[model samples]
Target: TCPFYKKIPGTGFTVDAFQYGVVEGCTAYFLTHFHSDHYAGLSKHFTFPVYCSEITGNLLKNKLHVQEQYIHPLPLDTECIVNGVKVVLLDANHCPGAVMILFYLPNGTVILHTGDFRADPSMERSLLADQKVHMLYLDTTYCSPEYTFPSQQEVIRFAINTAFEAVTLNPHALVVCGTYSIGKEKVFLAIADVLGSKVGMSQEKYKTLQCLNIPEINSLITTDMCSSLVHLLPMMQINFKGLQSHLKKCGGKYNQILAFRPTGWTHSNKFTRIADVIPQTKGNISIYGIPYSEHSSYLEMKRFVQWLKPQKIIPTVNVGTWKSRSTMEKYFREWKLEAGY
Candidate 1:
C-alpha cells in the first residue's frame, strides 16, 4: 500500500490523500501517478483540486472519469506557487508522467517527496545543480541489498532486441508482451518502432496509449490485429491458462504464442555487475524480467541521501510498522553520524 496523505506539520502541504478521500482543509492535493495504490481515492464525483503531470491528468480525465476542472496539470521542471508554497515538479523516472515533488517552504526549508523514482542520472544532475533536500520522503521499493539492478537503457535494448528476434524467428505468432496498463509503454513502443509494426492493443489499452501522447509511443499504435503480429496486454494474460486459452481461440490465425515481461525482480540476489543479462525461460512462455526498476535500490537510496544530504529522512512506506521503519531510521542515523553530517 502507498502513503495516504501527509500534512507537513508547519507548512500544511498534503500528499497522496487517498486514505482520507478528498477533503477541503489541506493546502492542495498532489498525486504522483495513476497507479491504483496511489490513486485509490479518485472518483467521478470527486471535487478536490488535484495537481499532477499532463499524462496523469489525461489518465484521470479520460480513463478514471476525473473531471477536467479539478485536474490541475503540472509541467515537469517548472516551478509554480500554490497556497504560499513554492513547488517544482521533477520526473520521478517511474511510469510516464510520474513526478517527485519539491516543496520550498517560507521558513527557508526545503522538502522532497520522491513519489516513486529510480536512480535516474538526469534527476540526480538536476538535484545537484538546482535544489537540495532538507526532509525526504522516499519510495522504499527494492529497499534492501538483495535488490541490485543494472542500467535501464541496456534493459530496454535487451527487451527490444528480444521481442524482435522472437517475432521474426517464429513468424505468424502472437508475440505477447505483458505489462501494467499504463506503465512500461516504452518497451512495446521500441519494439514497434524498430520492427516497423504496430502493436495490437485492446480498446482500453489503446486509450491508455493515446492519453500518454508520447509521439514515439503514440505513433506505434494499431487497433487492427492484422496490422501487427505483436500484441501488448496486461500481466494477467501471460500465464499458462490464459495463453493456452488465447491460442486455442486464435489457433488458426497465428502459429506460436510467446510471452515476455519486463521487470526488476528476475535478477534478485543474482546480479553481479552492469553488463549482465540473465535470461530466464520456461516452456513456450519466456519472461526476461529485465533489470528495469523505477525505484531506488537500498544501496541507491543510501547514495541518494548522501548526495542530497537531507537533514532528516522520513519513512513513508510501512508508516505504521515499527520494525522495518526503525531499522531504516537507525541506518540513516548511523550513516549521517559516521559521515560527519
Candidate 2:
C-alpha cells in the first residue's frame, strides 16, 4: 500500500511510504532529469517501474549506468499509460535529456511536474497547447531575486568568444575550460565549430562521452596530444594534484594556457586563490565567467507557474531541499497560493 502519511519533522506535509519505497502499490515514478538531486534516490529506493524521456533513459543507461529493467523510455510529447496513470513527456530544454512530465490520473486529477527547465519559447508553446492540468510542481531553485542568468545561446556565445580571445591572444598556449561533462560538451562543440577543428578532451572525459555515445560531437584526447587546441576538464579535476602534473607536462610544449569555467567558480574565494597560483610559465590562465545555469531562473519559473494556474502547486526534487525551500516558498507566496499539503 502507498500514501500513508508520516510527518517530515519540520515540513508541514506527511511523507508517503512510496516516497522512500521501491515497490509501492499502484503508484508510478517518473524521473525528470539526470541531475543527481532528481535521480540519486531512485537507484536505492525506486525499483518498480519508472518512466522518463528517451534521451533521459539513454543518458541514465549510458552515462549514469542505471539498470535498464526499471526504466521505460518514451519520446517527447507522447502520452503513455504507466501503472494506469497517463503520463506525457515534455521538452525541458534546460539541458540535453532533461524533461518535464504531466501526469493524468484516473480520478480526473492532472499534475504537471517541471524538472529543471529553462524558459525556452518553444517549450512554453508546447505547454500552452496542452489544456488539462490541475496541479503544478515547479522548479524554484533560482527564485531568489538576485539569482539571474543569461539565455543559453547568449552564454554559449560569450563562452566561445572568451575562449577564442584567450587562444588568439596566445596561439601556442593550451586552453582548458572547467565545466560539467554533459552541458560543457555543447560548449566544446560550439568552440570547435567556431575554431573549425577538434578541441582536445581529457582521457576520462573522452571515455565518459564515448560511453554516453553523444552523437555528432568530436572526440577527446589525452594531455600528451595537446598540440594547439583547447583541453576541457571537469571543474572537480582541475584541483587534483596528479591532474596538475599532467597539465604541466602538457604545457612544456605550449607557451600559453587558458581555462573556461562556469560563472559559479568566479563567485568563490578559493577559485581566486587557485587562479593566483597557476603556473605563469605555463601561460596565463583565463576563466570565462558566464551565467549558464541548467535550471530556469526566477522570471521563467514564475511565468510557467502563472501559465499552469494550478489549484494546488507543489515543489519537487531541488525545490524541497533546505537550501532551496525558502526561495520556493517565496515564489509560491508571490503567486498568492499556499503550496502543497
Candidate 3:
C-alpha cells in the first residue's frame, strides 16, 4: 500500500498499518494514533510489535484485548531503543498520546514519520529545533492547494463561538460535537473549560483519560449523558436512525440537540456553495460544519517543508492518488522551484 515510501520489500518499517495482513513482513511497526482505520486487523490477531504513545498502548491493551506484553509504550520527549532501532517520540498534538516518530537508523540517517498531526508552532522550541531529517514521511491527507483552511487554534475559537451561540439560543439543548474515540481530547477539554460543564462519554474513555493524567479532562467528564451539557460521541457513532427520538426533541422538559462536526472537508466544500447561516444541514437538526483538523493545512505543510530541508520528502498517505514517489518528487520539485521565483 505504501509503494511510494517503501525502500525494500519485507524489510521496510511501516507507518499506520491498518489492514490485517497488509504489512506481511514489516521489520517493525509505528502507530500514530488509535484510530481503527489505521489498525484494522489488530484485535483479530496481533502479529507485529507496535511502538506508540503510552496512552495509545493502553487503548489497545484494554479495548482490543491486545496482550500487554505486545504493546510497547514510547514516552514523549524521550528516546528508546527497540529491535536495534533508535526512536524518539514527540507529541503529535493531534490526540492524547499521539506521537510523531523519529527513527535514528544505523547509517547516520534520520527518518521522521509524522503520523497524523498539525504543524504546531510550540514544537519549534521543544522537539524539532535542531533536528535533521534525511527523509521525511509526511501525513499529507490534504496535500493539494485547494485544501486551505484555518489553523487549529483559530478553528477552536470558531468552535467555541459556534457552540456557545447554539447552546445560548436553546435553554435545554445539549451541544453535541462528533469526534473519534481517542482523538480530539484537547478540543473536548477546550470546550469544557469555556462552558464550565461536563462532557458526557463512555466510562471506558474516562478511565483512559485518567491513565494519561490529563486532570483538566478527568475533572470535567460525566458519564451520565442526560445531565451533561456537551455530548461527546464517536464520529462514526452518529446515527440518525438510532437517535431519531434523542435528536428530534425540540419540546421543553426534553433534551434538545445541536449536532456539529469539526472537520476540514466542510471548509473545502464551503468554497462556491451558497446556503444559509450555517453552511450545511442534516434533516431537522442544525448541523454546523466547522474547520477542525489534525492534519497540516496546505500552507502549513509548505512552511514545515521549507524549514526542515530534507533531501527527499515522501508522503506517508495518498498512495492511491500519487502513483509513485517519482511522481510526488516531480510535483514537489516544481512547487519549490516556483517558490523561489
Candidate 4:
C-alpha cells in the first residue's frame, strides 16, 4: 500500500510513481504523456486513475498498446475533478499526445505540471494567465542554454522536401524515414499528401485511431489499397526478407516507396546500422534525420519557467533528485528576482 501524506514532510505535492513509502500519499494527482520517463511506472506502481488529454489516451492505448484500465480521459483546456483535486489539461504543443496538468488545491495553492512541452509562442498567453498558479513542475530535460531546435514548420518542410527529392532521384526505389508513430503521423500525412496517396498505420495504431474516432487522421490501409503510390509501414514490419519479397514481386516499379519509424532510430546503434543497410541495397533509401521531438529543449523550458513565474518550480518525471534540486537552484538564481513571482 502507498504511504500516508504526513509520512513525507516539506514536499508540497508529488507527481509520477516511485518505489518508496515516503511521500507516496503526497502524490494526490498523477499526470502522464507518451514519454517513457513519464509513463514508465504506470502498470507497475501507479494504479491510481491517470489523467491526460484525449489524444494522449488514444496514443497510449493504440500506439503504445498499453492497457486502458488505468486511463481517465480529459479534453484540452477543460477542468475535471480527480480525488477531490481540481485538475485541468492544457495543450503542451510538443506532440499530439502531450499535455500539461494544472491543479488547484483546497489550501489555495495552484500548481502546473508541464509534461514536456515546446516553445509555441501562441500558447504563452494562456499559460501565463493562470493567476492562481503558485508552483510549476517544469520540463528541464534540456536545461542548458546551448540546446536548440528548429521549428516544427521547418522540420515538416525539410521532411517533405527530402522525401520528394528521394522520389525524384530514384522513382523505383523504396524510401524509409523514421519518427515516432503517433507524433510524426502528420509528417507521414504531409508526405502522402504530396505524393497524392494515403498514409498507412500498423494494426495497433489503426485500432487506437478508431477508438479515438479520428477517421481523418487514421492512416492504416487495406491490402487492396497497397497499390496506392505511398504507404506508411511500421519500422518493425520492414524486415530484410519482407523487403526482398516485396521488391521481387513488386519489381521496384512503384512510383515512390516510403517507410517511417519512430525516433528510436537515433538512439539505437544496432538500428542505425540496420537503417544504413536499407539504402545500400534498395538503391533509393533516404533516411530523413528530422529531429521532430515531443520534448522541450533547454531554452524552451527556461522560457516556460520565466513566463509562468511560479513561486517555486519543481522537476518531476525524468528529473532526478540531485538534478532537479540543482535545476531549481539555477532557476531561482537566474530569473526569480527579475520575474518576482
Candidate 5:
C-alpha cells in the first residue's frame, strides 16, 4: 500500500513515483501517463531512464520539454527485459498512452500495477486472459458503494443529446464543454461531431491535440471563435464567473452559455437518474456535470478485483489516513471473501 510508487519487491522498477524523488535501488522509472498528479515531480531535472508508451513519451518531450535521450517509449502489449526483469505494458483505458505495467520478477512472482484505469471487459479478455498475477496495485479512486456512475458511452451520448436540445431551443447559445489538458477527448469530440459543429480551442490545447495525432479531431479545429458554437475550455473555467468573463471577451456574440463538465467527482449513488447528476443554472449560464469518469466504478472495480484473484491487493488512491484507507479495504475484503479464496 505504498502511497508513492515505491520500488517493487525483487525488481529495480518504480511506477509513477516521480514526486517522491529517486528510489534507492531503482534501475528503471515508469510513468503511467501524462496526468499532472501522477507526474508532479517530473521535470527537466530528472535524469533517470524513463519508461512509458510512445504517446506519453512525445507528450513528455513536447509538454515538459524533458530530454529525449533519457525517455524510453516502449510498445504496448509487448514484453521486454528491463534490468533483468520481464516487463510488459497493457492498455490502462484511463487516457492516451496510459498503461498497466506487468512485471515478471526473477523469483517467479508476477506483479501488476494499474496506473489510474477504467474497467473494461476487453482488457480482461485480451491482455489479462488466464493470467496469474501474484500482486496487484490497483487504482482505487472509486472503491466505495456510492461512487457508481454511468458508462462512458452513455454519458457521451447524453452530453450530445443535451447539447443538441439546448441549441435547438436557442440558436444563439454557445456550448462550452469542459476538459483537462489531455484526457476526456472523446466526450467533447463526439459532441462536436454529432452536432456538425467545428470546435474552437486555445492554442495550447490545439498544440497538445496535434501532438496526440488524431486525424478526426484535428480536422475539427478552428481559430475563429465566431465560426463554431461549441468551444473547449479547461475544467477550471467551466464556472459561471469564468464563462461570464469569457463571454465578455467574445464581444457578446452569443446570448446564453450552455456548459457541460464531464467528470467522475460529480457523481453519487444517491441520485437515481443520470440527468440529475449535477445540474446548475444561474442567469444566462447553465452547466451540467456529466459523470464521464475515466476511473473504474465500484462494481467495475469489484469485478476486476475478483477476477484477477491476486494474492495481495494494494489500494492506490484514498489512502492518506488509516480511516480513509480502511473504508476501501472493507469493500475489498468483502469482494475477496466472495471470491471464496
Candidate 6:
C-alpha cells in the first residue's frame, strides 16, 4: 500500500525499487520511466543492471549521470529474455520514454506492470491483450469513483480552443503553458500550431526534448524566451506571483499572462459541463487548471481492468494508507464481479 512495493512478487528482479536501498535478492532492477517518483533512488554508483526504454536510459546518463554499462535500453513492443524471464516494453501513452512492462517469468507467471499510463484503445490490441496476466501492477493514479474527467483528446481540444480564444481576444497577451519535464508536449505544440507562434523554453529543457527525438516539438522550441509569445514553464512557475515575475522579465511587450495549468486533479464528478471548469483571474493574470492528465480516469481504469481480467489487481498509487487501498480494492472487486472475472 505504500506505492513502492520494491520487490515485485514471483521474480528475482525489482521494479522501481532503488529508494529503500539495494534489494538483497534483486537479480536486476527495472525502471519503468525517468519520472522522479519511479526512479527516485537511482544514482551514479548504482551497480545493479538497470532496464528501461532507450530514451529513459539516455535520461539516466544525461540527467542523472548514471554509469553507462549499468543502463540497459530496451526496445518497445519486443520481448527480450532477462535472467530467464521474457520481458517486453509497451508505449504507456503517459509520457515520453514511459512504458508498461510485461514479464513472462520462468515459472510461467505473466506479470503486467503498468508503471504509469493513460489507458487507450490501442492497449487492448497489444500482444499481451489476449494473454492471461497473473499479476497486474496498475498505475492507479485516479483509482477513485469520482475521477471521471474527459479524455485526453477532449481536454486537448478544450485547451487549444480556450487558448485560441484568449490569444484571439488579445494580440499581445503572453501565453504560458505549465508542464512537466517530459509530459504534456502535445497541448502546447498544438496551441503553437494553431496560433502560428514559436514555443519558448530554457536550453536545458530543449536538450531534454531533443533526447525525446520528437522532431515536431523540437522544431517549435526556441531558446530565445523573448522571441516567442507562448512560453512553456514548469507547473510551479504558472502561479500568480511567478507569472507576475515572468511578465516583469518580458519588459512590457505583453500586457497580461494567460497560463494553462493542465493536470488530472482539476476536474471531478461535480462538474457536469466542460464550461463549468473555468479559470481563476486576478489583476491581468489568469491560471486555468485544465483536466489534461497523463493518467487513466476511473472509468478508463475500470474498463481496462475489465478488459484484461487479470487474476490479481495491484494499485501502484494513492495506496499509502489502508483506507485509500481499501477504497481502491472495493472498486476492483466491483469491476471484476461485473465482468464475471
My TM-score estimates for the predictions, one after another, are: 0.89, 0.77, 0.83, 0.73, 0.94, 0.94
Report the lDDT tens digits of candidate 2 across residue range 59-121.
666665668887778887776766555667787776667777776767777766676777555
Per-residue lDDT for 1-341 in model 4, tens only?
43331121233445544334444345443545565655544443445455676777776666555567766788777667776767777877765667777778777778777766775656677745747567777666666555565555666776677667767777665554443344656666677677666644445555544554446653533333345555555565465555455546555466344554434214433233322323323543333344565667666666666776677665543454776567557755687676665
lDDT per residue (tens digit) for residues 1-341 in model 1? 32333656466567776657545466567898888878877888887778899999999999889898999998888879887777888888788888888888888888888887775546577844576667888787666667677666777787777767777887766677787746776777777777778888788888877888676655578887666767877787777778777767654787667666766665453735534545445456555555567677777777777777788877776556778777667778877887777
Model 5: which residue pairs collide? none
Tell me how far the alpha carbon of residue 101 in candidate 2 is from the true structure, in angstroms, after superposition: 0.5
Which lDDT values do the candidates have, in the order given?
A: 0.74, 0.59, 0.69, 0.57, 0.83, 0.83
Per-candidate clash tally: 0, 4, 2, 5, 0, 0
Q: Model 2, 293: alpha-carbon shift in Å?
A: 1.1
Best by lDDT: 6
Native-to-model Cα distance after best TM-score fit, residue 38 in candidate 2, in Å: 2.3
Model 1's alpha-carbon lDDT is: 0.74
Candidate 6 per-residue lDDT over residues 47-96, each given as its tens digit: 88999999999899988889999999999989799887889999999888
Badly placed stretches (over 4 Å) of model 5 are 1-5, 276-278
Question: Clash pairs of candidate 1?
Answer: none
The CA lDDT at 93 in model 4 is: 74
- Stretches of candidate 6 exceeding 4 Å from the true structure: 1-4, 267-269
Residue 44, model 5: Cα distance from true site in angstroms = 1.9
Rate residue 214 of model 4 by lDDT: 49
With a 3 Å backbone cut-off (N, CA, C), the pairs that clash in candidate 3 are 18-38, 18-40
